[PDB]
Ligand binder design. Sequence first.
Ligand SMILES: O=C(c1ccc(O)cc1)c1cc(Cl)ccc1O
Length: 208
Amino acid sequence: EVETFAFQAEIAQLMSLIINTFYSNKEIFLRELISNSSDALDKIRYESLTDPSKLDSGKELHINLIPNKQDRTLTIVDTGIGMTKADLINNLGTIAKSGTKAFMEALQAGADISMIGQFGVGFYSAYLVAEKVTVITKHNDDEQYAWESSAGGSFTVRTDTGEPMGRGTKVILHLKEDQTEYLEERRIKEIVKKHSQFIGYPITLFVE
Ligand SMILES: O=C(c1ccc(O)cc1)c1cc(Cl)ccc1O
């Protein structure tokens, strides 16, 4: 059972801007996704301080970066709070309508695409390098779901039954053919060191 949804007009507009605007500094997508993972890990950490049972679904708080050259995918995995089906559908827990408006107003006032994260819509920078994005998530209060979108104005949501993840979110980036540099170990290391060197959770770069 696959449900298909239309993006709200402002988000479709944001995604089209990200896909069609000439902007060479695409590497910021990884900083934005690691920042989202760090925010999700802060949330489960904070909840766990008053209710330790919130960590029954996994005590380790970390981020993994998994390149796969054969599948042309870069996966970002975290053991953060995860998202309910309701929050997945509601723009992956973001204030994407108001955030898109504020980002649009900033771009007209001198901002550049790298400042996207300041407006709470950093997730959508995945579309600088991915033709398709799959988001697998598990929140303590709901079941495991898979969100997917190749942009074009719609996304799908389905229950995910293969590979239970305990708790957290997995962002699978199906890379564009000219963006395979982001599967190279030395390139990922360089971007992590440049933009995410002080993230408060261990970041493990997997090898092949
Ligand atoms: O699960 C979350 C999430 C949940 C709540 C939250 O406030 C922030 C991010 C998640 C969302 C994205 Cl899009 C990427 C990584 C993630 O860890």
